[PDB]
Amino acid sequence: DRPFIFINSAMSADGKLSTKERKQVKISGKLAFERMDELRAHADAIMVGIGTVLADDPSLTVKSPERKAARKAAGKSENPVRVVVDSSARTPLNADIFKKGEGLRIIAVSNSAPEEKIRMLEEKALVIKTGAFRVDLTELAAKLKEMGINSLMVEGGATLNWGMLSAGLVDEVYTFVGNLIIGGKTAPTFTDGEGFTENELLGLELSSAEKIEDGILLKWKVK
Amino acid sequence: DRPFIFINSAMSADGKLSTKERKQVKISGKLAFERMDELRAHADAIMVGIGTVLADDPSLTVKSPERKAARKAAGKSENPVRVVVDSSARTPLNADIFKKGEGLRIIAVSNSAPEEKIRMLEEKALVIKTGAFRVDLTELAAKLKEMGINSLMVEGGATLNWGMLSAGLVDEVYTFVGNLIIGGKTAPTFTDGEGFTENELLGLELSSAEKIEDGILLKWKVK
Ligand SMILES: NC(=O)c1ccc[n+]([C@@H]2O[C@H](COP(=O)([O-])OP(=O)(O)OC[C@H]3O[C@@H](n4cnc5c(N)ncnc54)[C@H](OP(=O)(O)O)[C@@H]3O)[C@@H](O)[C@H]2O)c1
């Protein structure tokens, strides 16, 4: 069992999350950010892969003071729980996640992560250890549920999106499709990793499509 | 100068044209095929990369007898011109393109293609030679225009889509987004090749979005 899980990502018209240089580029405008901010404020937790933390160093904070005050007035942290999937415990001790905002941090690591680096992280985050050499996402999802995380927003990363989807852990997939072509066989897509074969394709159902600023927001139910 | 050029492709919700095994899978239903068939019947020419011919061996024919009869009654071939971008002249002499339907075939090759294989193709197609080691798409587009091809449908292939887009030859991009996740860092996307850097991103404008069967058809104007 697990929380309700949805992926929320912005991709170019050709399906890329960023350039081959893994440089993050303007895919969306203000209205799309507000929609993302609102989703963050609503979720119990936000999850991202270590690849995203290293490449972009995001805070994963709710930006609107009002949305933060509202969470606050509901007796919750100003920010939801912030989870990094990080097998080898590479999350830097001065990552922006640890610098900005109140709220719990969780680092999910594997049993093969450096025992001394864990200890350093345990000073500023909760560390959940799971899996042999890679985080066991199914197991992690179960523990997050048990901790009372009923809604989990995966802002992803190409490989983590794959991790979560191929493990059958996802309920819904939201893709803001921006008005640009990024290109490149090596640019990260909305779903990388190994890939499904013809015999394992994951079916979706379209729930909505909404033009927003210069792009379009598509939402699918998984299965 | 060049014909009016549009890319028409079907991709999974995560931007893939097919699986990592390069196996083609059901992305769309009947209505989407009818829309594709109508587009084929309307274009002067259809262009595909040699990777697609080798992987899928498509006929690139108009399937509807009525749409073929209508082209016919307008004094044209039942099928538009069928172009393969094929630097090394790998198009097989028994490819389905040569077996099915009337109409002109063109093979676009580079100046480094085997001189004897050209001759074999020239029996069943027109061969336009252009470029040193890879087909010069800009040059090709110019010759196709001169031949009176005013409308060119690129059904693509991941790498050819990149070729055409990065050469600035494309006016519009149509993507039927199907209700499935394919996944895989090595699965072909709507645009592979080298990829744009942050400084060379190609801007689009959304022209329409139309739910069709279980997917959604997005159309963009380039720039
Ligand atoms: N446009 C958007 O909305 C958006 C949002 C977020 C991110 N991004 C983009 O995503 C890009 C990076 O994506 P990415 O794939 O490199 O990084 P990622 O998906 O954020 O994280 C991937 C890493 O997670 C770790 N992991 C641990 N256990 C795993 C499991 N069971 N399954 C899958 N992964 C597991 C793996 O590394 P270890 O094994 O070393 O731990 C894996 O390489 C960035 O350039 C960023 O711009 C875009």
Ligand SMILES: NC(=O)c1ccc[n+]([C@@H]2O[C@H](COP(=O)([O-])OP(=O)(O)OC[C@H]3O[C@@H](n4cnc5c(N)ncnc54)[C@H](OP(=O)(O)O)[C@@H]3O)[C@@H](O)[C@H]2O)c1
């Ligand atoms: N879902 C859909 O609507 C749809 C439609 C069509 C195709 N597809 C998929 O596309 C996949 C294959 O894509 P692909 O990238 O391998 O093949 P492709 O894009 O059809 O053709 C690529 C090849 O074109 C040749 N080419 C020659 N000059 C070029 C130039 N200037 N720029 C770019 N390419 C040039 C190159 O090989 P040489 O240098 O050897 O000539 C290149 O590798 C197939 O698996 C198929 O299922 C999907």
